[PDB]
Amino acid sequence: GMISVGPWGGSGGNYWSFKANHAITEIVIHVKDNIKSISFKDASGDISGTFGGKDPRENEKGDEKKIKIHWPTEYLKSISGSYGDYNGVLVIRSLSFITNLTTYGPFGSTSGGESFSIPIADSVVVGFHGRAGYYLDALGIFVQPVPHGTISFGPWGGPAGDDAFNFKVGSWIKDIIIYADAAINSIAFKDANGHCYGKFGGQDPNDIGVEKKVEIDGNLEHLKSISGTYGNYKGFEVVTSLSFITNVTKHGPFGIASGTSFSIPIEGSLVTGFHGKSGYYLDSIGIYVKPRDVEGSISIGPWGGSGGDPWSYTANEGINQIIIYAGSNIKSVAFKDTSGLDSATFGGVNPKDTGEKNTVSINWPSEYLTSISGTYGQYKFKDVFTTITSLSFTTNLATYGPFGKASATSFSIPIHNNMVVGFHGRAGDYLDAIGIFVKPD
Amino acid sequence: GMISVGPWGGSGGNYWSFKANHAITEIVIHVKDNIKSISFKDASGDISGTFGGKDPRENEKGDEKKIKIHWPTEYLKSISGSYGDYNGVLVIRSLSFITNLTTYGPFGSTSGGESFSIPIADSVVVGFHGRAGYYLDALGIFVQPVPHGTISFGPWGGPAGDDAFNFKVGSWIKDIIIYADAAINSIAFKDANGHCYGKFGGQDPNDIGVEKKVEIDGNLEHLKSISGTYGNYKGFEVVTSLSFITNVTKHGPFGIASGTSFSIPIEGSLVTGFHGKSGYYLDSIGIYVKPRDVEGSISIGPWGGSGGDPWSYTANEGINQIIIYAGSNIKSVAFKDTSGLDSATFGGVNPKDTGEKNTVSINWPSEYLTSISGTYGQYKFKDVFTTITSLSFTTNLATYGPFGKASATSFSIPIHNNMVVGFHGRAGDYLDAIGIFVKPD
């Protein structure tokens, strides 16, 4: 489960990759004028084999530079460098390796090239990829988030804005509502669950702009990336255009393409959030991404009634906390994870009937969710509803609950060798129904 | 899911591996006296990068040789070669590449030490691994079964025998029964289900040997490989000693080590059967292996009564067919897979009583098993039994059943985005209990 970034450099040579089994602790380059070749080593002593360095010319050859990464206190987090001509072929000319502690390089030549850098954070480099033949034509990285982190790119745009925004979702981005004329005036977003984020921007009464929507069909499509431009608009530096890149198509552009353009060459990603600043307009924006082994999880249930609005929550890392409100039945549920991803509250919408707060703690990852059990049936307040009435959560070490009160119809899952990676169901005033997402382990 | 074989060669340099994403279609070696270096190229054009050849010497470059594999009509299945001293280092001295149609090589010096060969069959080489520094210290391969096949190794031993054996299991080897004194007189095996395999050998009326047992605890251990010796015993060429290699320990030797030794350096393998020849003694023995899954498997259930004997069945490739004999309930169920793996029959141990035969076909892989549901209740013949009363099987395309007759209590599994890879439960005269093994998709 990792995100591909890049590669940067020429289009020649053949694709290679090296996904380290253990942390990357060494990089070996041969340099003269350009980068002749690269190889790697992980913490276990495994090596990647050498990419590039293939002539037959012996001179050229290049001086050996070894770069040490002091795992675990130091880890590789990113790279920079430059590309440009060699013998007529577009290749890597210089490289720098960026850790949580310092930067190594640049190695190679700093002049006469197109340089690249990556506006990334909260990442660890767990491998490389690129192109090679006689030379290293191109180089990229594979990244995973730091423990308890979420990879982010950007933001791009200008420095101002009065309202900062920052969110991550536990399902997927389903809708994007943009207002735009020459600039992006505002953006807002909806969850798979129908939860709305923002109106970030559009505070200028004279200048709200013109509404356009992106509607993502989650059965066929997922948001993978963004691109756009930023520049002047009425004296300010703001986002002037955006496009939304999925696995199917590119939506937009929205706004008009002016100033500096930006993009992120990423694959294997799902966008799970956005951060930036807005005021009158959209000053700056960047994304949060999670790796997609989006080909992946088993779903069980839900159990319970058919009322309520459907919801789902999949952890970014590990489910840490459950907040259950209960009385005679389960009014609401909510989840938190070790990376700080907190679900909306599912249920508990009628303030006359919200029950009592219960918190469940899970010492993740040595303790982790494993199953649920409970009952469902009729519950009356003003109307009659069919809901979850009692609920328990089991881990590898413990069973928490039951919360609520037992009604006749019980439910349970005689299941083993699994972990629970998220939940789903229906909720309105109460928790109508609940089930689980599981993976082996 | 692949098995590692070898590597052969010295302990110098560093470990490396290459697992191709598509079929290996090219191999590049540099040869002078030893193999200076190696790299690979798969059908999409992706390269591995170069292992070895870090020598700063010149008449140390070696001549480049390319080997093409004419995929998909030709595929790599094995290798052979030799290793020995070069400048005081134990390295790969020569190599050959073995295909379904032909052999390429030898490349390098044959005159030189130790040769190696692999008595393998039904394999596809999907990768290599080895050790490399200045030179190519060592090489091995990763393998998978051909479609519908099972990787085999051996047999080792002498060429005669009046009887022959050849079986595979759908659980694992729990027991091994050996009669031995100076040679191996006979061998037998038990399933995890207690089903017995043969007694092969022990036909000398004057010389049957002393019994010894190996018990494998299927919770902390699994059979991985075997080794042993073969040579003369009273004018027969037979297996003289065997040991049984698990992920933890090595059980044996049984018999006495005399004549020629054999071993097969594999990792990632689960032994799933045996083949060979036997008569008075054990003439020859070989193994079947399956990759121990880097993917794990979720268990659900079982549902039903507590009576009976535990059994499990896990498909080698994918479930193809099911046989049930239920009338007023369920005497037995059985299963077949697309690789020829046939399960035992799980109860219908009463001559009297076996209901009517029912064959269910699944178009694996385009059609595949989804879940189950049934009933349990009380069934009476001579006495009273809590068994599974009726039963149904869902796939991604259809349901099959029920069989027999629905009772009071009806269990089901509200599961999605999964495939069933096997079953487990309890059986006697009837199917007391049944549950499933699932994975995502």
Swiss-Prot record, chains A, B:
Pfam families per record: Jacalin
Is Kinase included in the keywords of this UniProt record? no
An example of a Gene Ontology BP annotation on this entry? heterophilic cell-cell adhesion via plasma membrane cell adhesion molecules
Kindly state which keywords UniProt assigns to this record, in alphabetical order. Lectin, Mannose-binding, Repeat
Q: Which residues form the Jacalin-type lectin domain?
A: 2-145, 150-291, 297-440
Source organism superkingdom:
Eukaryota
* Reported modifications of this chain: The N-terminus is blocked.
* Classification via CDD domains: Jacalin
Job description of the protein = Mannose/glucose specific lectin. Shows agglutinating activity against rabbit erythrocytes.
Something else the entry says is: PubMed:11502201 authors report the absence of the blocked N-terminal residue, together with 3 to 5 amino acids from the N-terminal part of the protein.
| Subunit organization | Homodimer.
Name used for this protein in its record: Mannose/glucose-specific lectin
Which organism does this record belong to? Parkia platycephala
Q: What is the lineage of its organism?
A: Eukaryota, Viridiplantae, Streptophyta, Embryophyta, Tracheophyta
